[PDB]
């Protein structure tokens, strides 16, 4: 007698003879495992590693005849160490690279039994999941990272997965804060995947991430534009100043070269030209041609009335051709990527 | 008497029939768990990861009537492996990124049983906890970093957290010597937080950090100021020295960018403009204008009043640029100091 003893003998009756080796209703119809997620945060998104780190509260909800009990109206909340004594789904993340269940104080697990035998099983998880990124639009791109949930051991003949509440099964997307990215939306999918060993159930959670251009405007585009404008100071300096005109020009070209090579050190060595690379090569041509501008005028001024006329005409043209053409190139660049 | 045989058999009866699966007073009112923390150190605070590392002695006090014993005056202290044989609440830290309990020699845990059944459970923990930071005032900012404490499984119907001793429940914050920050204030909060599965008890410990500007004055502002001053040396050099005033101009412009490239490494890739970034672009404007000044002077001179105009602009730039940068420098600091 006494409710403490009554519960103790009730739980023992549930577990005495309970075979953890057999799934619920083994041999019979497949057991449906409903699950839902509360996202804690996305720690980081890495292009160099082509992955992102996701922290979440992952929960599973299934029915087991063997755990039904009567005489107790309460939903028994047992110590998390009971997880070692119960059958639980072999769910796993297919695209996961590295993950762990948080273990501070005591391993972060929850089990909540109910009279009819339905079990709620919860975990707090951090997973570094692979996410391949189409960097051709970088940094004006948007990406589709996903988490791929699947059962390892049991095929569709034994396990069925479903989102509890449909589209309402995932929460916490509102509290994901990232410097570079803002979540345009998230999407939930359910599928059956077929391997050589059979057809397995799948649930997929997808995030569409759109990048923030603020950082790259200040750090990359503004320098390149300012250095390119700096190249036009050459056209206004007198043509007799060979030392100054050349020194201004070559140093500008040198600066553009270092900017071009530097940025690729912070991101994966992907073998194709990105949107920003096209811009930096576009800027390079202008600063490079702005140096040849002085190369020819020097040749015409000294080595070839052509000494007085053509030398002045070419320099005067450059003061309007270069600024105009750079704006023409700049206008086409943003209309191509931002407006289309 | 307190013979070890008597103590052994006493401890055996307490554990005989004990069930770790059930909380104290199961089915009855909630278990009152009293938290208590002694801060050992805050190892580091990093903006690039939006997190800080904290090491602490973490203790929990609760009463379990199943462990009450009589005939022993002592508060029994036992080998820490008794922890695996007893019920201990499932406290955890919400915003931690990765954490571990120290394991040198033997896992740093403590259990001390009192005659009335009160259990003292303590363990030394090092936690790396997330702290989102507002960098809109980077060298001149203030930050709130918190440690959130919660029970994973048991709702408020089963467990009630509280700070044992009230505002005295956290100690050692008096003694945290952070190099880049200073603990202006800390405060303790308790509340109930509701999810779909129920209302859970929560305690949270908050620190308010104010930064030390010393490092950034030495490494970013003074270099920016001195290079900006150096750019004004062009105005004193004669206009005829084209190669000199251009070299003095181009070099300063590319030194300002060299400062930005270093700042590109110390912080996360944030979209918005920070206070330091605003100052660097402020300096870049003066350094950039310091070279446009010569370009127009060279154009005016070589393109006899023209000789006078070139000299006059040097006289104007010799006064306007130092005066305007001082005015800009004055307005900048007053904004971030008064606000």
């Amino acid at each position, epitope marked *: 007698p006494g409710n403490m003893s009554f519960v103790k003998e009730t739980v023992d009756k549930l577990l005495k003879g309970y075979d953890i080796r057999l799934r619920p209703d083994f041999g019979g119809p497949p057991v449906c495992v409903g699950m839902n997620i509360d996202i804690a945060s996305i720690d980081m998104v890495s292009e160099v590693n082509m992955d992102y780190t996701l922290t979440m509260y992952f929960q599973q909800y299934w029915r087991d005849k063997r755990l039904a009990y009567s005489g107790i109206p309460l939903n028994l909340t047992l110590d998390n160490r009971v997880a070692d004594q119960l059958w639980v789904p072999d769910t796993y993340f297919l695209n996961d690279k590295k993950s762990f269940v948080h273990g501070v104080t005591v391993k972060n697990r929850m089990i909540r039994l109910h009279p009819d035998g339905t079990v709620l099983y919860g975990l707090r998880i951090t997973t570094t999941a692979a996410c391949m990124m189409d960097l051709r639009r970088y940094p004006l791109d948007e990406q589709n990272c996903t988490l791929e949930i699947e059962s390892y051991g049991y095929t569709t003949d034994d396990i069925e997965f479903y989102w509890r509440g449909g589209d309402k099964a995932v*929460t916490g*997307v*509102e*509290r*994901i*804060e990232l410097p570079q990215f*803002s*979540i345009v939306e998230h999407r939930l999918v359910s599928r059956n995947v077929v391997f050589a060993t059979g057809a397995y159930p799948r649930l997929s959670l997808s995030f569409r991430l759109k990048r923030n251009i603020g950082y790259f405007i200040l750090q990359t585009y503004m320098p390149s534009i300012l250095i390119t404008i700096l190249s036009w100071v050459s056209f206004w300096i007198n043509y007799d100043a060979s030392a100054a005109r050349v020194a201004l020009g070559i140093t500008t070209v040198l600066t553009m070269t270092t900017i071009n090579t530097h940025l690729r050190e912070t991101l994966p060595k992907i073998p194709y030209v990105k949107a920003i690379d096209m811009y930096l090569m576009g800027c390079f041509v202008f600063v490079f041609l702005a140096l040849l501008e002085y190369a020819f005028v020097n040749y015409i001024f000294f080595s070839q009335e052509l000494y007085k006329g053509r030398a002045a005409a070419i320099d005067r043209w450059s003061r309007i051709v270069f600024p105009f053409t750079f704006s023409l190139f700049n206008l086409v660049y943003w209309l191509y990527y931002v407006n289309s | 008497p307190g013979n070890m045989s008597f103590v052994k058999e006493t401890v055996d009866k307490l554990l005989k029939g004990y069930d770790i699966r059930l909380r104290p007073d199961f089915g009855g009112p909630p278990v009152c768990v009293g938290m208590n923390i002694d801060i050992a150190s805050i190892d580091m605070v990093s903006e690039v990861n939006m997190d800080y590392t904290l090491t602490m002695y973490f203790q929990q006090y609760w009463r379990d009537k199943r462990l009450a014993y009589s005939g022993i005056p002592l508060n029994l202290t036992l080998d820490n492996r008794v922890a695996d044989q007893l019920w201990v609440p499932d406290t955890y830290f*919400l*915003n931690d990124k990765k954490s571990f309990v120290h394991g040198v020699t033997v896992k740093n845990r403590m259990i001390r049983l009192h005659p009335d059944g009160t259990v003292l459970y303590g363990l030394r923990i090092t936690t790396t906890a997330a702290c*989102m930071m*507002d960098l809109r005032r980077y060298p001149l900012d203030e930050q*709130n970093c*918190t440690l*959130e404490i919660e029970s994973y499984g048991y709702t408020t119907d089963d467990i009630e957290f509280y700070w044992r001793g009230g505002d005295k429940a956290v100690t050692g914050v008096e003694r945290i010597e952070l190099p880049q920050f200073s603990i202006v204030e800390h405060r303790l909060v308790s509340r*109930n*937080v*509701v*999810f*779909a599965t129920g*209302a*859970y008890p929560r305690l*949270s410990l908050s620190f308010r950090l104010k930064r030390n500007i010393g490092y950034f004055i030495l490494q970013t502002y003074m270099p920016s100021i001195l290079i900006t001053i150096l750019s004004w040396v062009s105005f004193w050099i004669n206009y005829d020295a084209s190669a000199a005033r251009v070299a003095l101009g181009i070099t300063t412009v590319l030194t300002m960018t060299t400062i930005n490239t270093h700042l590109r490494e110390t912080l996360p890739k944030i979209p918005y403009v920070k206070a330091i970034d605003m100052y660097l672009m402020g300096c870049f404007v003066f350094v950039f204008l310091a070279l446009l000044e010569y370009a127009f002077v060279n154009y005016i001179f070589f393109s006899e009043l023209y000789k006078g105009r070139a000299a006059a602009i040097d006289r104007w730039s010799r006064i306007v640029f130092p005066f305007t940068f001082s005015l800009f420098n004055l307005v900048y600091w007053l904004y971030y100091v008064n606000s």
Partner: nanobody
Amino acid sequence: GSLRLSCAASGHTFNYPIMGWFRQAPGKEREFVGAISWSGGSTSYADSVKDRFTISRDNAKNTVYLEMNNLKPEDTAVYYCAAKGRYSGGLYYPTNYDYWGQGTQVTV
């Protein structure tokens, strides 16, 4: 008909990234309506206002807006505006919101 509500904030709004709209009538529990995130733009709603209302924000003016479009008679209530901490619990529960507005009445 249609209507629009505005909610302005000041102070340490960085510590309270999410703003929520709640509504109540005498003799009834306080209901959830929707929420918006500073700097994130993501929004969520109650099913009773899906596709009828829309919450938007101006991050520079520090104001949250609820485009109360496509009214119905059952929308009579005082629409409190509230803020939520970063690490508080679920959105749909008023107990998680610390700072609350004056609750402007609307009648339909």
